[PDB]
Write a protein that holds these residues in place. Structure first.
Motif, PDB file in Angstrom:
ATOM      1  N   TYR A 134       0.811  -1.217   0.000  1.00 15.59           N
ATOM      2  CA  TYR A 134       0.000   0.000   0.000  1.00 15.59           C
ATOM      3  C   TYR A 134       0.848   1.272   0.000  1.00 15.59           C
ATOM      4  CZ  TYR A 134      -3.334  -3.378   2.253  1.00 15.59           C
ATOM      5  OH  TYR A 134      -4.099  -4.448   2.587  1.00 15.59           O
ATOM      6  N   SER A 135       1.930   1.276   0.777  1.00 13.32           N
ATOM      7  CA  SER A 135       2.694   2.430   1.210  1.00 13.32           C
ATOM      8  C   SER A 135       1.792   3.467   1.872  1.00 13.32           C
ATOM      9  CB  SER A 135       3.551   2.978   0.065  1.00 13.32           C
ATOM     10  OG  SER A 135       4.324   1.928  -0.485  1.00 13.32           O
ATOM     11  N   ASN A 136       1.158   4.354   1.100  1.00 18.66           N
ATOM     12  CA  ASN A 136       0.675   5.643   1.585  1.00 18.66           C
ATOM     13  C   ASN A 136      -0.805   5.808   1.223  1.00 18.66           C
ATOM     14  OD1 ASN A 136       3.586   5.803   1.929  1.00 18.66           O
ATOM     15  ND2 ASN A 136       3.549   8.006   1.863  1.00 18.66           N
ATOM     16  N   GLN A 137      -1.624   4.770   1.446  1.00 17.70           N
ATOM     17  CA  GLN A 137      -2.997   4.726   0.939  1.00 17.70           C
ATOM     18  C   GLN A 137      -3.967   5.450   1.875  1.00 17.70           C
ATOM     19  OE1 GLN A 137      -6.360   4.173  -1.481  1.00 17.70           O
ATOM     20  NE2 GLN A 137      -4.240   4.548  -1.914  1.00 17.70           N
ATOM     21  N   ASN A 138      -4.584   4.743   2.826  1.00 22.66           N
ATOM     22  CA  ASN A 138      -5.360   5.343   3.910  1.00 22.66           C
ATOM     23  C   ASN A 138      -4.811   4.955   5.272  1.00 22.66           C
ATOM     24  OD1 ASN A 138      -7.801   6.685   5.078  1.00 22.66           O
ATOM     25  ND2 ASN A 138      -7.872   4.656   5.990  1.00 22.66           N
ATOM     26  N   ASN A 139      -4.768   3.646   5.516  1.00 24.20           N
ATOM     27  CA  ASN A 139      -4.521   3.126   6.858  1.00 24.20           C
ATOM     28  C   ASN A 139      -3.090   3.400   7.292  1.00 24.20           C
ATOM     29  OD1 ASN A 139      -6.906   0.954   7.965  1.00 24.20           O
ATOM     30  ND2 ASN A 139      -7.005   1.672   5.859  1.00 24.20           N
ATOM     31  N   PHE A 140      -2.156   3.587   6.355  1.00 24.41           N
ATOM     32  CA  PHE A 140      -0.790   4.019   6.631  1.00 24.41           C
ATOM     33  C   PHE A 140      -0.742   5.126   7.686  1.00 24.41           C
ATOM     34  CE2 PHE A 140       0.112   8.154   4.401  1.00 24.41           C
ATOM     35  CZ  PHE A 140      -1.206   8.412   3.994  1.00 24.41           C
ATOM     36  N   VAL A 141      -1.559   6.172   7.526  1.00 20.81           N
ATOM     37  CA  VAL A 141      -1.630   7.273   8.461  1.00 20.81           C
ATOM     38  C   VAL A 141      -2.735   6.989   9.480  1.00 20.81           C
ATOM     39  CG1 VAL A 141      -3.126   8.905   7.095  1.00 20.81           C
ATOM     40  CG2 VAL A 141      -1.295   9.769   8.563  1.00 20.81           C
ATOM     41  N   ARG A 142      -3.954   6.624   9.056  1.00 24.64           N
ATOM     42  CA  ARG A 142      -5.112   6.546   9.955  1.00 24.64           C
ATOM     43  C   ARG A 142      -4.921   5.503  11.057  1.00 24.64           C
ATOM     44  NH1 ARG A 142     -11.093   4.927  11.484  1.00 24.64           N
ATOM     45  NH2 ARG A 142     -12.171   6.893  11.117  1.00 24.64           N
ATOM     46  N   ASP A 143      -4.339   4.352  10.731  1.00 25.24           N
ATOM     47  CA  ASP A 143      -4.020   3.294  11.688  1.00 25.24           C
ATOM     48  C   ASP A 143      -2.919   3.768  12.630  1.00 25.24           C
ATOM     49  OD1 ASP A 143      -4.541   0.468  12.406  1.00 25.24           O
ATOM     50  OD2 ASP A 143      -2.615  -0.046  11.452  1.00 25.24           O
ATOM     51  N   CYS A 144      -1.919   4.462  12.092  1.00 26.41           N
ATOM     52  CA  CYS A 144      -0.774   4.981  12.826  1.00 26.41           C
ATOM     53  C   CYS A 144      -1.221   6.065  13.823  1.00 26.41           C
ATOM     54  CB  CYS A 144       0.253   5.477  11.802  1.00 26.41           C
ATOM     55  SG  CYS A 144       1.966   5.635  12.358  1.00 26.41           S
ATOM     56  N   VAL A 145      -2.153   6.940  13.422  1.00 20.84           N
ATOM     57  CA  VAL A 145      -2.854   7.871  14.300  1.00 20.84           C
ATOM     58  C   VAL A 145      -3.515   7.067  15.407  1.00 20.84           C
ATOM     59  CG1 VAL A 145      -4.777   9.586  14.436  1.00 20.84           C
ATOM     60  CG2 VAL A 145      -3.186   9.734  12.589  1.00 20.84           C
ATOM     61  N   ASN A 146      -4.374   6.092  15.080  1.00 19.24           N
ATOM     62  CA  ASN A 146      -5.125   5.369  16.104  1.00 19.24           C
ATOM     63  C   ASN A 146      -4.208   4.685  17.094  1.00 19.24           C
ATOM     64  OD1 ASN A 146      -7.922   5.817  15.505  1.00 19.24           O
ATOM     65  ND2 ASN A 146      -7.552   4.680  13.644  1.00 19.24           N
ATOM     66  N   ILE A 147      -3.111   4.081  16.648  1.00 18.05           N
ATOM     67  CA  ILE A 147      -2.171   3.414  17.526  1.00 18.05           C
ATOM     68  C   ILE A 147      -1.535   4.463  18.437  1.00 18.05           C
ATOM     69  CG2 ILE A 147      -0.107   2.124  17.683  1.00 18.05           C
ATOM     70  CD1 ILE A 147      -3.121   1.104  15.893  1.00 18.05           C
ATOM     71  N   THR A 148      -1.058   5.578  17.884  1.00 14.96           N
ATOM     72  CA  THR A 148      -0.427   6.629  18.667  1.00 14.96           C
ATOM     73  C   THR A 148      -1.393   7.157  19.721  1.00 14.96           C
ATOM     74  OG1 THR A 148       1.006   7.139  16.774  1.00 14.96           O
ATOM     75  CG2 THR A 148       0.834   8.813  18.499  1.00 14.96           C
ATOM     76  N   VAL A 149      -2.593   7.538  19.290  1.00 15.03           N
ATOM     77  CA  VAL A 149      -3.692   7.904  20.152  1.00 15.03           C
ATOM     78  C   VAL A 149      -3.870   6.832  21.223  1.00 15.03           C
ATOM     79  CG1 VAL A 149      -6.230   8.139  20.129  1.00 15.03           C
ATOM     80  CG2 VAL A 149      -4.845   9.447  18.508  1.00 15.03           C
ATOM     81  N   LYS A 150      -3.975   5.549  20.876  1.00 14.43           N
ATOM     82  CA  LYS A 150      -4.323   4.481  21.772  1.00 14.43           C
ATOM     83  C   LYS A 150      -3.244   4.293  22.829  1.00 14.43           C
ATOM     84  CE  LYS A 150      -3.998   0.319  20.045  1.00 14.43           C
ATOM     85  NZ  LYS A 150      -4.443  -0.570  18.955  1.00 14.43           N
ATOM     86  N   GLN A 151      -1.972   4.332  22.434  1.00 10.73           N
ATOM     87  CA  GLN A 151      -0.853   4.298  23.363  1.00 10.73           C
ATOM     88  C   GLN A 151      -0.848   5.526  24.295  1.00 10.73           C
ATOM     89  OE1 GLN A 151       2.240   1.032  21.623  1.00 10.73           O
ATOM     90  NE2 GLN A 151       2.699   3.047  20.856  1.00 10.73           N
ATOM     91  N   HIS A 152      -1.747   6.502  24.102  1.00 12.78           N
ATOM     92  CA  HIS A 152      -1.991   7.589  25.023  1.00 12.78           C
ATOM     93  C   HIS A 152      -3.350   7.432  25.697  1.00 12.78           C
ATOM     94  CE1 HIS A 152       1.118  10.528  25.991  1.00 12.78           C
ATOM     95  NE2 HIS A 152       1.759   9.556  25.319  1.00 12.78           N
ATOM     96  N   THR A 153      -4.407   6.935  25.051  1.00 13.98           N
ATOM     97  CA  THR A 153      -5.685   6.743  25.713  1.00 13.98           C
ATOM     98  C   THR A 153      -5.546   5.720  26.841  1.00 13.98           C
ATOM     99  OG1 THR A 153      -6.646   5.140  24.099  1.00 13.98           O
ATOM    100  CG2 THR A 153      -7.062   7.467  23.688  1.00 13.98           C
ATOM    101  N   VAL A 154      -4.882   4.583  26.596  1.00 15.18           N
ATOM    102  CA  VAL A 154      -4.605   3.596  27.634  1.00 15.18           C
ATOM    103  C   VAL A 154      -3.756   4.235  28.729  1.00 15.18           C
ATOM    104  CG1 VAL A 154      -3.801   1.314  28.220  1.00 15.18           C
ATOM    105  CG2 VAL A 154      -4.684   1.671  25.940  1.00 15.18           C
TER     106      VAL A 154
END
Length: 111
Positions: free
Chosen positions: A49-69
């Motif tokens: 994929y490289s740079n499709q959708n989830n490249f950024v959106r998943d990476c946002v959610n993980i970063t967010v999640k490692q702060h929400t937890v």
């Protein structure tokens, strides 16, 4: 103290990003002292994929999640309004981290 994150990798560091929300309060709200926020994000080898959708959106959610937890462990909450900015700024970091050296390897875009 740090003991809650551990899943994704650690992406390269940078300056505090700054996206143009153009609403002047909303801009100031971070422009004040935003450097207290992290200037690294957490990624994974996506390939293909490289740079499709989830490249950024998943990476946002993980970063967010490692702060929400984290915050759930700490004893704090965010706002939807903070989250609007936080998403844009982490979203930008997840692109820009990739644009540091991943874009020298993968992808293109000289202009």
């Amino acid at each position: 103290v740090v003991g809650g994150l551990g899943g994704y990798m650690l992406g390269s560091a940078m300056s505090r990003p700054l996206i143009h929300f153009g609403n002047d309060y909303e801009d100031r709200y971070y422009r004040e002292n935003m450097y207290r926020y992290p200037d690294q994000v957490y990624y994974r080898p996506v390939d293909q994929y490289s740079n499709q959708n989830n490249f950024v959106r998943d990476c946002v959610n993980i970063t967010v999640k490692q702060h929400t937890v984290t915050t759930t462990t700490k004893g704090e909450n965010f706002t939807e309004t903070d989250m609007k900015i936080m998403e844009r700024v982490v979203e930008q970091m997840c692109v820009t981290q990739y644009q540091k050296e991943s874009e020298a390897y993968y992808q293109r875009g000289a202009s």
